Design a protein around this ligand. Sequence first.
Ligand SMILES: NC(=O)c1ccc[n+]([C@@H]2O[C@H](COP(=O)([O-])OP(=O)(O)OC[C@H]3O[C@@H](n4cnc5c(N)ncnc54)[C@H](OP(=O)(O)O)[C@@H]3O)[C@@H](O)[C@H]2O)c1
Lengths: 48, 1210, 93
Amino acid sequence: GSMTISFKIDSCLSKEGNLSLSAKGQLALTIEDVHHLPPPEEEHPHMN
Amino acid sequence: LDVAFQTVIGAYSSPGDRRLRCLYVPTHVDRITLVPSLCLATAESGCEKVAFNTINTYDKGDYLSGDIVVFDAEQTTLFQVENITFKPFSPPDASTDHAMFARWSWGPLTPDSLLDNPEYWATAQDKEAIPIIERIVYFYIRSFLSQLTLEERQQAAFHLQKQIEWLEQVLASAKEGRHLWYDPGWENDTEAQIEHLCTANSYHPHVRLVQRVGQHLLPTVRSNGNPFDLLDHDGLLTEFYTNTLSFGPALHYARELVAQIAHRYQSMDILEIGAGTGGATKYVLATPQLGFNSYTYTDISTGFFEQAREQFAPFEDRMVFEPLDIRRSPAEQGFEPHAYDLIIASNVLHATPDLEKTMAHARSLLKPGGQMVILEITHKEHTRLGFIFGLFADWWAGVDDGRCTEPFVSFDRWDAILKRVGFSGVDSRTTDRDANLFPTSVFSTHAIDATVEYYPPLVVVGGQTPQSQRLLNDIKAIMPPRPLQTYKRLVDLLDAEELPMKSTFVMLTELDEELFAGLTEETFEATKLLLTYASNTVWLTENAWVQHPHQASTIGMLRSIRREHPDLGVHVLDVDAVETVEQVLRLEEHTDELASSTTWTQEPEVSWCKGRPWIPRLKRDLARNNRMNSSRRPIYEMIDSSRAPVALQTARDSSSYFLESAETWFVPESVQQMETKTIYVHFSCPHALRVQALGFFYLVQGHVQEGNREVPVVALAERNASIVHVRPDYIYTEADNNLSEGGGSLMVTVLAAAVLAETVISVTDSILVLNPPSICGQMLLHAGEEIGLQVHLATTSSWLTLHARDTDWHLRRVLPRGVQALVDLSADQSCEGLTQRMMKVLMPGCAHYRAADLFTDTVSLPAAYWEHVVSLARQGLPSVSEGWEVMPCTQFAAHADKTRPDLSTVISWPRESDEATLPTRVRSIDAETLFAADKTYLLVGLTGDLGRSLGRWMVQHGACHIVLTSRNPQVNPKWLAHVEELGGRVTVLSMDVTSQNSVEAGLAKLKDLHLPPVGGIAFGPLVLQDVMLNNMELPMMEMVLNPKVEGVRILHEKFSDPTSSNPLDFFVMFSSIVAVMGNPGQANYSAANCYLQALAQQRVASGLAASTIDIGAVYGVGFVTRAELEEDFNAIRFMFDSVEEHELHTLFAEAVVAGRRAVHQQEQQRKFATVLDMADLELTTGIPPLDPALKDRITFFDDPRIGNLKIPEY
Amino acid sequence: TTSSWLTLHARDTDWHLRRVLPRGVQALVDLSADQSCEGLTQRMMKVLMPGCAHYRAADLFTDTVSLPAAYWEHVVSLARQGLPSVSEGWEVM
Ligand SMILES: NC(=O)c1ccc[n+]([C@@H]2O[C@H](COP(=O)([O-])OP(=O)(O)OC[C@H]3O[C@@H](n4cnc5c(N)ncnc54)[C@H](OP(=O)(O)O)[C@@H]3O)[C@@H](O)[C@H]2O)c1
C-alpha cells in the first residue's frame, strides 16, 4: 500500500541556458486499488 | 498552498513590525502531507475557504521553519506541513540588521582641557627611548644647538650655509650633523648604539629612522635627493608616526579629543587636513560609534586618497575625498565656506609657511563655533628629534615666520596666532609635563564668533532647601544684569500675581520638594502655568536618576515638554552633589541662545557628575545589537576565549563547526547544580561522548582556579567551550602528568567511549566493535578484559581486518558467531552498508549501536566512573604520543566536518588573550537558559498579549514559575495549561499594584499557592492618557503615574533588602522610548517611565538587581495591538521603531542580563554612584535609523541626544 | 497509539511530538506492526532524549529463528493480571 517516488522539478529560465534544478524531494503515496492526518491543534487561543 | 506558507511568516511576523527584514523563500520542506480526497472534496464543495493553524517552529531569523495544518470546516485536515524552511532570497547582510538597541553613552559636555590619560603617558621605556639618544648628544648640546639648526636647513639653506651644495662639504657637514650627537666619543659606534635601541620596543621606529636617514642624508643634504624617500617607499616614517610611544600617545590623545567632541557635537561635518596615508585618520576615526555626518578626507596631494578609499571603506558612506592646499583659500578649491563642524590638522600646519593664513582658511571652512583639532610640533627640544625632522622638503618651509622651520609654536603662541586668525584660543591641550609629546601635542579650539555670552526676563523658582538657598544666592550674584523674579515654591509661582510670558525659568524646586512628590497641591496646575509663561527654562535636580526618582519623573515630564512645546527651551541639570556652581547660569544663557545654524548645540539635558558636566547620547549598543542579530545571521565579534566562554558549536544543519559565544549571562542556579566548577579548558574532545546513558558530554581538560592554583583537571563538559561550568561529579581533579597535555584528554575520551560501550550493553557475553580508533581498540579490549566481556575488534583500514563493501557471505565466514551486540564506531559512513550486512549475519536481534549513539555534536555521576575510566586509560597511555591529533580550535572550526567526525581528535584551546582573542560567532542573548526553576518571576501588569508572550518565552528559557499580575487579569486557564506544557507553572495574581494592600495580598497569596520566592519582577503596568499638559488634568497624571510610580515604589519597598535570602535576580521596569526622548501628548507617560528608570538606577546603586527597557512601538503585542494602533505608529515609524514580540523578549532578556551583570560588578566594587555609570542598565530601544530626509516629520531630530542614530544626508 | 494511551497519529509533526511526548523517556519501543508509523518513530528520535534507546517491532517480533523458570513464572503472573481484557478467541485463525 505504498509508493515512494523521487521527484525533481528541473527548471530553465531561458532557452540560452542549460536545464537546472528548481526543486527536488520524495513522494510517499498511501494508495488503494481504486482522518488520515492528525486533527489540528485547538485553534490557538489568543491571537491578535 | 502559498498562502498557507505565508501563514508561517504571519506567525513569524505581525503586520507593521518588520520582523521579516529579508525575503525568505521556501527552500526546504521537511514533510508536506496532503489528503487528496479531502482537498478535492473541498474544492468541489464550493466553500473554497478552509481553516488553518501554523507554528513558526524556528524563528531566530537565519531561516524560518514552520509547520502548517490546513483543515476543513468540520476540522478534518486537508493537508499539513512540517518544518517548511523559508531561507532568505539572499543571505542577510548588516544592512538588514535591527539597530533598535541603544545605550546612553555618557560623555563630557566639553572636551577635557588637558588630555592626561595615564595609559598615553610617555612610558618608562619611551622615557628611556628618547633620553638614550639624548645621552648620545647631551654632552655638548648647548654648543650643538645652532649647528643643529643649520643641519635642519638641508631643504632651504644648509647647502649654502657651508657651501654644502658641493659633495666634499656634503661628506663633511652631513657627518658633522650626525656627530652633533655622535661627537662625545660615540662617533660611528652610535650606529651600533642606535641598533641597541632598534632591537626592542618604545624606540624602534624613531631611532631606526635616525639610522636609516643619517646613513643616507648625504645626497639629501645637498638638496639633491628626497629627504625621506632615501628609504624606499617610506619604510618607517609611517611607522614613526603610528607606533612610536612619543608620537603615538599624542595620536591617542587626538582620538580621545575627537571622540569627546563628536560625542558632544554629533553629526559633525569633519574635514581632516594632513591625513596623508590616514594614520591620524585611522586613530581618530577608529573611535567606536562617533558622530560623523560627513568626513572630508583631505590632503595637499590626492595620491593618498586611493589608499584612504581602501582603508576607510566602512566610512565611505559618510566619507568623501577632496584635496585641500592649506596654503590656498578653500573656497577657491570647491569647499563650501563655513560648512564644516570640525577640522583636524594632522601634523601638517608645519608644512606650510602661511600658518596664520592656513588657520584663517580653516576658520573660513568651519561653521561658527566649529572645533579645530591640531596635532603639530610645539616646544622644541633639540636633544630628541633633530635627525629626521631636519630633512623634510617642506617642514622648514616656514622659517619665514621667524624661527627655525615652521616654528615649534608653543601652546601660548599657538593660542595667540589661533586667536588672531579668528578662533576661541587653546581650549584643550595634551599633557606635556615632561617630554616626548612636544612634537605632536594636540590642541582643541573653537571657531569663535558672536558665540556664547559667558535679556529676556528671568524667574527663579525654588531655593527652599539650604543648598537650594545657597544656589539661589549664587544665581543672583553670578547672573548678569537681568530682570529678576523669585519664588520660594512652584505653588507660590501659581500664586504669583504677574509673570512674564517670555520668561526664562531657573527651577530649583526639584532640589526642594519635588513636583511629582506633591502634585496633589496644585503643583501640576502650577507646572501648566510655568509652561504657559515660559519661553526658556532650566530645572536643577539633585542626583535625580540615582537618588531622587521624583526629580527624574520631573525630568521625563520636561523631556516630553521639550517635544510638545518646541518653542519652549527645556533644560535639566542633574547634580550628583549640589554642594559641588556657576554652570546653571551658563546653561540658562545657553537656552537664551538659539543658534540653530552653528555647531554649538542646545544641550537639552546635562548632568553634573564628579565636578564636571556631562551629556547622554544614544549610541547603538553594538554588543547587544550583535547578540540580537546573531539569531538571524553569523555575527562575529572579537572575543577572548581564554577568559570568555567560547563554545566550538556545530552548525544547526551540522554543516560544520564554528566558534560562538558561550556566555551563560549569569544564571544564578548553582545550588541544586551545587558547586559548579569553572574549568578553563586547554584541550577538549570535539565530539560529545555518551556516558552510561546519562547523556552526551564533551571530554575536556584544563585548569581550575583553586586559591589561584591552576590545577589541571579532566571533566565531562556539556558545551565544548574554552570555559565550562560543570558539576564536580563530572570532574577528575587529579593533576596527573601521565594524562599529558592533549594526549591525556584523548585517552580519557577513548575510555569514556569504551566504558559506554561496555556498560550500555552489559547483557551480553560477546560483542563486536567495528572500525574503532586504534587507541579505542586497545582500550576496548582492556575494558572487555576487566568487565569479562569478549570484545572483538573489526577494522576497515588482533583487529579483524575487514573491508568496506565486503559480502555478507564473507562476514559470515569471518565474523564470530558468539557476538550479541554490534558497536559501529566507524566515523566514515562508508562502512554503514557493511554494518547493515552484519545485522544480517550476526545473531538475530543483535544489539546495534552506531557512532552517533556514542559520539555526537549536540548535547542541548559516580566517582567510580571516572576512576575506572582513568584506570583503564592508564593501561594504554604509552600507545601514542601526547600530541597525536592536536589541532587548534580555530583550525578545527575552519577545516572540521560534522559528517566526517575525527574521533580521538583533540582541540587545543588557546590560553593567552592574544592567542585566544578571535572572531567568535556571537550568540543570541536568549539562546541559553536565563532563569532559575526555583524562583517566581512576577510580571506586573503583564497579563496582556505582551506579558503572556514574555511569560511563555521565560518558561521556554528556564522560568518554571511565573506570576502575571493585573487589576483585571483576563487570561484563559487553558493558556496556563499551554505554558505548563512548556515546563513552567504560570498563574495570574489579580494584583492591583497601585495599592500597598493589594500588593501585599498578592505576595501573600504567592506563599498561599506555595510558589517559590520572587526572584525577579517584570514591571510593565500601563495606563495611557494622550493629552497635552496644558489640557491635561492632575487626575490623569495620577492615573498614569500611580500604576507605574506607586507600583515600583511598593515593589521596591517590598524587595529593597539586599541581605534577604531571595534577592531579585532582576527588576525590569518596562519604560517607553518616549521616556528617553519624550513624545507630544505623553509627558505623563514619559514622567512615569522616567520614575521607573530612576528607581532602577537607584536600586542598582543600592546593591539590588534592576534595569529598564525603553521600548519602542510593540506591534506584535501590547496596547498598540489590542487597540489596533499599528497604522498610527507606522505613520510615525521614523520616530519610533517597531519592537517585535520576540525582539521585545530579547530586549527584556538583555535587561535582565544587564541587571545581573551590574550586581556582579557591584560584587566587583562598581558603585554606580552617578548617572554616567548606569547606561548599561537602561536599554534604549525603538529608535530607528533617523533619516535626515524625514527630519521635518521627526519631532526630535533636532535633539542631540539621538545624534549618533542619524543616517547619511548626501 | 496511532489508532491511558497517548493517542498520537501517524505523520505527526516533530513539534507536536515535543509538545506531547514526555521528556523523561530514555528508550523507545516501536511495536507498530504497520510500517507507516516508521517515519513518526524517526521523528521521535529527534524529539526524545539524545541517544535514546530504540527498539523496533523487528527487534521484538520476527518470522525467522534459524531459561530460568522464574521467567515464565513472571510471564504468567503478569498475564494473570490482565487475562479478562479479551475473550479466548480474540484473533484465532
Ligand atoms: N510605545 C511604547 O513605548 C510601548 C509599547 C508597548 C509596551 N510598552 C511597555 O511595556 C509595558 C506593557 O505595555 P502593554 O502594551 O502590554 O500595555 P497593557 O496592555 O495595557 O498592559 C498593562 C496592564 O497592566 C494593568 N495594570 C496592572 N496593575 C495596574 C494598576 N495598578 N493600575 C492600572 N493598570 C494596571 C493594566 O490594566 P489591567 O489590569 O486591567 O489589565 C494594563 O492592562 C508597558 O508598561 C510599557 O512600559 C511600551
